[PDB]
Amino acid sequence: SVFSERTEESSAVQYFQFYGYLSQQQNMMQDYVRTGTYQRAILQNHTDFKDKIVLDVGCGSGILSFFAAQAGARKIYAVEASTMAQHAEVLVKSNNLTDRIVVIPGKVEEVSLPEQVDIIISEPMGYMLFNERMLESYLHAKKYLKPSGNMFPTIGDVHLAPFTDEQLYMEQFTKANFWYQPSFHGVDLSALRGAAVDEYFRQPVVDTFDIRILMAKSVKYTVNFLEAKEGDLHRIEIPFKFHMLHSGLVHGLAFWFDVAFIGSIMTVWLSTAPTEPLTHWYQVRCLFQSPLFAKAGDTLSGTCLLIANKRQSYDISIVAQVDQTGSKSSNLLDLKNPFFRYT
Amino acid sequence: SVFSERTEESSAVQYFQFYGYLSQQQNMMQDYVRTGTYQRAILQNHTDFKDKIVLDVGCGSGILSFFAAQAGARKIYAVEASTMAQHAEVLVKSNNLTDRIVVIPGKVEEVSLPEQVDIIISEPMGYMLFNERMLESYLHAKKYLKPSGNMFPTIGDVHLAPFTDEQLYMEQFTKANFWYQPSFHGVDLSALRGAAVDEYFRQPVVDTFDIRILMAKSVKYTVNFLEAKEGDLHRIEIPFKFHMLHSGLVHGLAFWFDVAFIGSIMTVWLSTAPTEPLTHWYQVRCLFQSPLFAKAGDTLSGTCLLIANKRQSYDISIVAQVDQTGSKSSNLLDLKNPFFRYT
Amino acid sequence: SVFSERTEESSAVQYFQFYGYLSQQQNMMQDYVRTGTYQRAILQNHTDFKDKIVLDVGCGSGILSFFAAQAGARKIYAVEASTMAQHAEVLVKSNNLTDRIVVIPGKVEEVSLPEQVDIIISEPMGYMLFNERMLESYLHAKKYLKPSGNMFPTIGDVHLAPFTDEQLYMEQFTKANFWYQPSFHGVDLSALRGAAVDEYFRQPVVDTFDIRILMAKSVKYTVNFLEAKEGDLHRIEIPFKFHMLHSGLVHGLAFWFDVAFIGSIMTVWLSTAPTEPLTHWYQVRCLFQSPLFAKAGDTLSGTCLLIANKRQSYDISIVAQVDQTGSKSSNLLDLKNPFFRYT
Amino acid sequence: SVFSERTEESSAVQYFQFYGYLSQQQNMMQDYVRTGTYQRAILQNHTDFKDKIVLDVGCGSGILSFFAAQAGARKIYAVEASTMAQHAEVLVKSNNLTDRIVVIPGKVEEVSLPEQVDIIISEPMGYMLFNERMLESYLHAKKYLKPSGNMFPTIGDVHLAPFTDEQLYMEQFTKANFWYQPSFHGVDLSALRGAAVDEYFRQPVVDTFDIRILMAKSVKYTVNFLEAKEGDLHRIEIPFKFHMLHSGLVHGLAFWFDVAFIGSIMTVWLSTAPTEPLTHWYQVRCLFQSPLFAKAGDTLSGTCLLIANKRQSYDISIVAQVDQTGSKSSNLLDLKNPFFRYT
């Protein structure tokens, strides 16, 4: 299928195994900012659902389909590829909605829907928005979308901003320097030290932080889900030019994302920004092995390039330079393999 | 090969991917009880290594091979299936031991050794000793062992003992009762509560605990690595009959393990027992979904059956009864998916 | 002379220039622990001075000769090589002691005394006791000492103890990692990092610290000034074996020293130990480029070798290992270029 | 050579020993105003470098030669007399510029260049501009300059202005009054008080200050490096006539300096003025022996005479008088021995 061609088996097996756990579904459900904003977006745009045909891509427990039902949808196809599909079905019966919600087990790239739909709803966002590559399945699902059908969410904004955080940098750096020691139990590791630093700084750091650590206004990259094609997400190039508001060491870029549900009655935003209340997405920071020094008023420019891989994630390339000194930093980060720092 | 036949391709990819991270090797290296006891066991039995031919099964960073070198081995074949084999080679050069340590990339079931060896060393122990099924690879490797060659470690003891821990027990329900609510954003979740309970109880719990929770002297199950065959580990039946030292509710069995390096000069023990300083193996507890009441002097009898699966782990069956009352409990856990509870 | 033989005339120029400043004399005089203890040692041992002939080696302002005069000496030869000799003479006249204190300009190795003395007094101690190599001039002066004449101070103890101090280690490390950066104004410095780390870690660090950072009881090395010869100080080998009292990272050895004035009436001690009030000698710490890990109960053994150079200082060699793991550290330091960190 | 003849070899040893430390090169490199302005001056005047032959006098780490290389120079001879030359060579190789930057170990007065150059670059400025007498080596290098070749920097301005700083003046006596006590542990020290005072006053003070202590617009003395000869710097007479903008006690003269890189495209200024951000040159203050009352509108006139010595520095003679009042003072200062007072 489109899905298996882009996905290593051993990756897909881990992936849907993970979403097969009630405890992981619960973890998403309990993100109240997440779950309550989806519900508001759907219920306050009830005219977008009343008597409509809906597709829920990756329905998990079914929770968004129940919201579509609460908003008056006529029929909701809830597609789910993990064994969580069987639990969703149980909930549909115990909630007496068998006449309106139809669970369809399988990958949205591989199942058959009986008819085209008025609106697709999903929660396909990973870390940094793009992790997991589920946004492609969401876009793929537009093959079932009627002309001028809507998408909920409708657009996604990824934000990047340079940050300073010596304590985080040193913390990762101290980790790598285990492999600097010349006599670990009589053994000289130091020859692997470079490869260690590379491996640790490959990991994006997932947690939250104070906005005070940000040294410039964020740059925004927007994906419009109504318009984008799957292939748009195979290679994502995000150019940036920051105007430094503070002097200091730039330790890397911080990422977060917002999505907007652009309904007929109103637009509702769900934000994972550090100025907003914390969600289970936290935020993400990619460190530089070698931080850049900049002065307030310098411009920091470069590119963040995300290249999709068959492990349902991205290889991240970040090149940045302080234009005023030509100090340049190059980094590649493996998004599939984040360091979850949050405590 | 023997390995590819007992192991799903996708489990193996994830498995050797995991050991490909320097950070994971580092995690094992930094277990000081682990690493220092291996070094002591080897160096204090130097006559077992002096001018010998050695096989290191799953050498990882190479660390144990270097200990064999420090003890005077003539030649060490260090076999390693993950990409960590490349880093090990780097260390062997930078430590100027290319004349004595030979790294051989691949699974010990699939590579060729040039010659038979005097002694096999390995650290193949998972959670509960048996997890990961690397003990089978260690046993398999005996095809390269000279007659009367030795094995380091030489034997492994798994210990089981009943525990009482009301807090751990009730945690499971407090978690699952997330689903016991008639209107979570309007949805009645309650029909999934039993499944959520089942799901948590299927997970063995990894962490340590005060030995005061133990209710009877442990029972011991021993694997002699000089003698055992691979197939002995496909189905491990561990009968038990505990004589209750304390009165209370038994909530499950706790597991830990020791290995002994029985050398020519001395026997060295590595223990992960809760009476001993903590190691990165912690201990493991499997809950009964129905506790059992035993008074001091009663006997709690039953069987712990471990059935190897192709996910490199075991399905655990525990049946237990209080002989004096006849009340019974029986539980299934998946050792491939432990709950890591330690903080 | 013996002095110009062992000293670059260059070094000796700067050295006596330095002591030619009243402000530097003032700096030693104002060390109240230093100056008050000398005065106590001399005045409380007044029988060792009453009607005696005294030599003051390197009299500076003259201060110690005045103490000898206060204790009743008959005649004091006050030898001083810097231009400070002229100011000393001024003080002798204005204090009306021309009949008892006789200033003699010159190096003690190069002047002529009219007669042999009953007692030599001096304050010849540098950082780590030995810096400046003035202890050799003090020993050299014994050519003027009558049989069974005394020396004040009489003995010196150097103390060594291992310490942990991650903040100091990182401070120094962070300095050297400047030479780690790949694009400093567009220039890759990283080739020089090894050499930068070598340079920074050669610098002994002078300042004080809480004794909480010491990980074992100090080892003591004693020089008995009555007995030692000049040449004994050319190459000082200090073997050590620390029984670790705390687990953690050993970042280096800390050094301090005591001298004793063993008089006829009492023995007075001048200590620069970190348990004692601060002197202008502070304490000295030699850092390892990579700390050694150790456990309480381990022994840390090795050698501190001091080799005198013609810059009036020492090249310091420290080799240490953790006996239990064979973990080893070798370091070379440059006592003639200490980093004065105190503030 | 010219260098040896004007320099005591022990001063030279000490001098090039100092620049042999990576930490000292680092200290200049990290002065961002210094290093960034040199880089701007060179890169913004790239036509002055593109395909040119360049001489870097005293290249240190090589940093300026790399800027010349970034601006497109064809060939750069980087001359360096300290052992830093060896580290510069390492950087030239690791930055793959061996085809364009040629390191030449030795004094610029003593080496041979293969050819004449289009432009000399250097950072030869000491405290008060002239300290270290490296400006003469810079001028001496013009023997290798093609006709109408350029010099970067092209001119230097020394600025002098009178300051009032009652606290700084009084601090000299407060320090010297240490000596003014009749019984310091029994000794009358007071006879040395005048010598202490003289000693402190001979030291120019290095630190920065609030510009409000300045009493008059600075007077400027200019060296045009394109025109000046070495000999011009042996005796530098700087007359001054300050038009007092403020009434009060004048305690001395403050010094700072600017240099200009007059390129084909633009002129870039590096300033160490107290109105500008701090550099590692700070500013320099010389006290009068007695303060002079001046009214705003009065004129304070006299001469600052700098006489080069063989310690690579200057004896400074300052004579000043308030023209309207006849009131007069002076001082003699030794620039080799400045007092570093900043914190």
Ligand SMILES: CNCCN1CCC(c2ccc3[nH]c(-c4ccccc4OC)c(F)c3c2)CC1
């Ligand atoms: C789509 N909505 C997700 C909402 N939310 C769920 C929980 C969190 C999360 C974070 C990292 C992850 N890696 C894989 C994965 C597991 C196996 C194989 C490949 C994988 O990703 C590349 C995941 F499922 C996964 C889920 C954060 C995001």
Ligand SMILES: CNCCN1CCC(c2ccc3[nH]c(-c4ccccc4OC)c(F)c3c2)CC1
């Ligand atoms: C043999 N010596 C290891 C010593 N030590 C290493 C770190 C710890 C550990 C714990 C659980 C694990 N599951 C898998 C796994 C990963 C992928 C697929 C299946 C897996 O297990 C069934 C692991 F590697 C793994 C490693 C505890 C034991």
Ligand SMILES: CNCCN1CCC(c2ccc3[nH]c(-c4ccccc4OC)c(F)c3c2)CC1
């Ligand atoms: C003998 N009593 C000393 C008392 N006390 C005085 C002040 C302190 C001190 C510290 C380091 C020093 N290096 C040189 C030096 C200066 C020039 C040339 C070589 C040098 O040392 C290797 C010094 F004078 C000197 C003095 C600490 C000790």
Ligand SMILES: CNCCN1CCC(c2ccc3[nH]c(-c4ccccc4OC)c(F)c3c2)CC1
């Ligand atoms: C040429 N550009 C230098 C830029 N910058 C470097 C660091 C600072 C500085 C200040 C005083 C100094 N005296 C000697 C010296 C050392 C030995 C012998 C005689 C000496 O001075 C006359 C120095 F190196 C030296 C360097 C301030 C200036």
Ligand SMILES: Nc1ncnc2c1ncn2[C@@H]1O[C@H](C[C@@H](N)CC[C@H](N)C(=O)O)[C@@H](O)[C@H]1O
């Ligand atoms: N190609 C795919 N086909 C079907 N389901 C998928 C696919 N990719 C991911 N999923 C499911 O999408 C879900 C992602 C969750 N973030 C959302 C769950 C649910 N919509 C909620 O809002 O709680 C998981 O249940 C996945 O197993």
Ligand SMILES: Nc1ncnc2c1ncn2[C@@H]1O[C@H](C[C@@H](N)CC[C@H](N)C(=O)O)[C@@H](O)[C@H]1O
């Ligand atoms: N069948 C196998 N063939 C080769 N290596 C294996 C096999 N199974 C596991 N390994 C490796 O064995 C190692 C197991 C570790 N517990 C030991 C690492 C290392 N010997 C140490 O003591 O630090 C991992 O690096 C695995 O990739």
Ligand SMILES: Nc1ncnc2c1ncn2[C@@H]1O[C@H](C[C@@H](N)CC[C@H](N)C(=O)O)[C@@H](O)[C@H]1O
């Ligand atoms: N070989 C030498 N001959 C004469 N004086 C020396 C020699 N070496 C060092 N000195 C002087 O000894 C003094 C050392 C000071 N620590 C002591 C000064 C004085 N005794 C006091 O206690 O205040 C300085 O004045 C040195 O210049």
Ligand SMILES: Nc1ncnc2c1ncn2[C@@H]1O[C@H](C[C@@H](N)CC[C@H](N)C(=O)O)[C@@H](O)[C@H]1O
């Ligand atoms: N006559 C001389 N010949 C060669 N190098 C000299 C001479 N005089 C001084 N130097 C060097 O000039 C350098 C002075 C520094 N201000 C400049 C270093 C470097 N070009 C930079 O700008 O970072 C030191 O490295 C000195 O050793």
